[PDB]
Amino acid sequence: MVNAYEVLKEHHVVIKGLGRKISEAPVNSEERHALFDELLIELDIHFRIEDDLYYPALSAATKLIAVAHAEHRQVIDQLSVLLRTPQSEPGYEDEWNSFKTVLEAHADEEERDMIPAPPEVKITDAELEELGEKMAARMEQYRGSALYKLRTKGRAALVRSL
Ligand SMILES: [Zn+2]
Ligand SMILES: [Zn+2]
Ligand SMILES: [Zn+2]
Ligand SMILES: [Zn+2]
């Protein structure tokens, strides 16, 4: 029996783990480039399940919902800056660290304020299980479409979809 909080917390662990593997791989290595694509896939589907399923269930917390969505903008805006410095360029590792910091702050801020749901949100244990089930299935569906984009249309197309 999984629930919505566990789905998101377990996926934050995945994302943080990819971020650590990226950081540990040599700059501009084949390994680091593949790991970064893997992170983009997981990030794409993570923000979508938050925006499409989890945050709507929490809509009664209007101020924290606004902050949550603005924090997504923070991550996407920083990703745009990161992609303007390729790994072959001297300032790349500074840009990667700046992005990693913003990404890690997403999860930390969410796990402070929004997991579990804020007090204004009335959601039952049974509803959290059904929501967790829907999120887990939607994650598989979204990963399929994210991969389709990356495979058939490229990394740029996957970034434009965030
Ligand atoms: Zn890998
Ligand atoms: Zn988020
Ligand atoms: Zn969003
Ligand atoms: Zn999250």
mmCIF file of all heavy atoms in Angstrom, residues 8 12 15 46-47 50 55 72 106-107 110 115, ligand 4:
data_model
loop_
_atom_site.group_PDB
_atom_site.id
_atom_site.type_symbol
_atom_site.label_atom_id
_atom_site.label_comp_id
_atom_site.label_asym_id
_atom_site.label_seq_id
_atom_site.Cartn_x
_atom_site.Cartn_y
_atom_site.Cartn_z
ATOM 1 N N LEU A 8 6.313 10.684 -3.784
ATOM 2 C CA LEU A 8 7.117 11.872 -4.024
ATOM 3 C C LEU A 8 8.439 11.796 -3.277
ATOM 4 O O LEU A 8 9.472 12.178 -3.825
ATOM 5 C CB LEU A 8 6.373 13.140 -3.625
ATOM 6 C CG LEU A 8 5.175 13.447 -4.525
ATOM 7 C CD1 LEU A 8 4.472 14.634 -3.948
ATOM 8 C CD2 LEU A 8 5.671 13.735 -5.934
ATOM 9 N N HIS A 12 12.083 11.938 -4.967
ATOM 10 C CA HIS A 12 13.110 12.919 -4.600
ATOM 11 C C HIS A 12 14.450 12.232 -4.345
ATOM 12 O O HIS A 12 15.499 12.767 -4.720
ATOM 13 C CB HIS A 12 12.705 13.724 -3.356
ATOM 14 C CG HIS A 12 11.633 14.754 -3.594
ATOM 15 N ND1 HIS A 12 10.860 15.257 -2.567
ATOM 16 C CD2 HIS A 12 11.228 15.392 -4.718
ATOM 17 C CE1 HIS A 12 9.988 16.125 -3.057
ATOM 18 N NE2 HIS A 12 10.214 16.252 -4.352
ATOM 19 N N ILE A 15 16.012 11.457 -7.677
ATOM 20 C CA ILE A 15 16.526 12.659 -8.326
ATOM 21 C C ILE A 15 17.817 13.108 -7.657
ATOM 22 O O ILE A 15 18.806 13.435 -8.334
ATOM 23 C CB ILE A 15 15.450 13.756 -8.305
ATOM 24 C CG1 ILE A 15 14.363 13.391 -9.331
ATOM 25 C CG2 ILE A 15 16.090 15.141 -8.587
ATOM 26 C CD1 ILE A 15 13.075 14.177 -9.128
ATOM 27 N N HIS A 46 8.570 14.288 -12.847
ATOM 28 C CA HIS A 46 8.337 14.680 -11.468
ATOM 29 C C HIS A 46 7.488 15.934 -11.376
ATOM 30 O O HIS A 46 6.482 15.964 -10.640
ATOM 31 C CB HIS A 46 9.672 14.919 -10.786
ATOM 32 C CG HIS A 46 9.547 15.168 -9.326
ATOM 33 N ND1 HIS A 46 9.383 14.153 -8.418
ATOM 34 C CD2 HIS A 46 9.572 16.317 -8.612
ATOM 35 C CE1 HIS A 46 9.314 14.660 -7.198
ATOM 36 N NE2 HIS A 46 9.415 15.973 -7.295
ATOM 37 N N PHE A 47 7.870 16.981 -12.123
ATOM 38 C CA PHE A 47 7.087 18.212 -12.094
ATOM 39 C C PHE A 47 5.692 17.979 -12.644
ATOM 40 O O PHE A 47 4.741 18.601 -12.167
ATOM 41 C CB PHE A 47 7.794 19.337 -12.854
ATOM 42 C CG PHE A 47 8.913 19.972 -12.073
ATOM 43 C CD1 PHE A 47 9.316 19.440 -10.857
ATOM 44 C CD2 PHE A 47 9.528 21.120 -12.546
ATOM 45 C CE1 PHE A 47 10.353 20.027 -10.121
ATOM 46 C CE2 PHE A 47 10.553 21.706 -11.827
ATOM 47 C CZ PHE A 47 10.962 21.160 -10.608
ATOM 48 N N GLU A 50 3.535 16.309 -10.012
ATOM 49 C CA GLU A 50 3.216 17.310 -8.999
ATOM 50 C C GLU A 50 2.139 18.262 -9.530
ATOM 51 O O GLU A 50 1.111 18.486 -8.866
ATOM 52 C CB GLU A 50 4.514 18.024 -8.539
ATOM 53 C CG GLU A 50 5.323 17.170 -7.582
ATOM 54 C CD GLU A 50 6.609 17.809 -7.190
ATOM 55 O OE1 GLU A 50 7.033 18.750 -7.848
ATOM 56 O OE2 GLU A 50 7.184 17.319 -6.206
ATOM 57 N N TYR A 55 -0.395 18.533 -6.534
ATOM 58 C CA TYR A 55 -0.756 19.879 -6.124
ATOM 59 C C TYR A 55 -2.254 20.162 -6.304
ATOM 60 O O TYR A 55 -2.806 20.869 -5.444
ATOM 61 C CB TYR A 55 0.117 20.903 -6.873
ATOM 62 C CG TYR A 55 1.564 20.945 -6.454
ATOM 63 C CD1 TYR A 55 2.551 21.448 -7.304
ATOM 64 C CD2 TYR A 55 1.935 20.475 -5.213
ATOM 65 C CE1 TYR A 55 3.883 21.488 -6.890
ATOM 66 C CE2 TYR A 55 3.276 20.514 -4.793
ATOM 67 C CZ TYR A 55 4.224 21.004 -5.637
ATOM 68 O OH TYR A 55 5.534 21.023 -5.164
ATOM 69 N N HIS A 72 8.858 25.657 -8.999
ATOM 70 C CA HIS A 72 9.112 24.969 -10.261
ATOM 71 C C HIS A 72 9.735 25.917 -11.272
ATOM 72 O O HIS A 72 10.688 25.550 -11.970
ATOM 73 C CB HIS A 72 7.823 24.407 -10.828
ATOM 74 C CG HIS A 72 7.384 23.127 -10.196
ATOM 75 N ND1 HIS A 72 6.290 22.430 -10.659
ATOM 76 C CD2 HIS A 72 7.850 22.434 -9.132
ATOM 77 C CE1 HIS A 72 6.117 21.346 -9.922
ATOM 78 N NE2 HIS A 72 7.045 21.325 -8.988
ATOM 79 N N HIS A 106 14.201 22.652 -4.081
ATOM 80 C CA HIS A 106 12.822 22.276 -4.403
ATOM 81 C C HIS A 106 12.319 21.239 -3.419
ATOM 82 O O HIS A 106 11.267 21.412 -2.773
ATOM 83 C CB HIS A 106 12.717 21.705 -5.826
ATOM 84 C CG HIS A 106 11.543 20.767 -6.016
ATOM 85 N ND1 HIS A 106 10.253 21.212 -6.199
ATOM 86 C CD2 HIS A 106 11.473 19.409 -6.019
ATOM 87 C CE1 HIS A 106 9.442 20.173 -6.293
ATOM 88 N NE2 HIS A 106 10.152 19.066 -6.210
ATOM 89 N N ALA A 107 13.041 20.120 -3.355
ATOM 90 C CA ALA A 107 12.647 18.980 -2.545
ATOM 91 C C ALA A 107 12.590 19.347 -1.079
ATOM 92 O O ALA A 107 11.611 19.034 -0.395
ATOM 93 C CB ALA A 107 13.618 17.821 -2.776
ATOM 94 N N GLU A 110 9.609 21.553 -0.401
ATOM 95 C CA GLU A 110 8.386 20.771 -0.501
ATOM 96 C C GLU A 110 8.221 19.839 0.693
ATOM 97 O O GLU A 110 7.118 19.699 1.235
ATOM 98 C CB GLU A 110 8.414 19.975 -1.804
ATOM 99 C CG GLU A 110 7.084 19.316 -2.138
ATOM 100 C CD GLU A 110 7.175 18.485 -3.390
ATOM 101 O OE1 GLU A 110 8.310 18.373 -3.928
ATOM 102 O OE2 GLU A 110 6.104 17.956 -3.804
ATOM 103 N N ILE A 115 4.559 18.161 2.167
ATOM 104 C CA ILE A 115 4.536 16.715 2.390
ATOM 105 C C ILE A 115 4.779 16.453 3.872
ATOM 106 O O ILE A 115 5.912 16.638 4.345
ATOM 107 C CB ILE A 115 5.598 15.992 1.545
ATOM 108 C CG1 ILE A 115 5.403 16.264 0.048
ATOM 109 C CG2 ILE A 115 5.607 14.479 1.856
ATOM 110 C CD1 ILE A 115 6.571 15.746 -0.812
HETATM 111 ZN ZN ZN B 4 9.052 17.328 -5.727
#
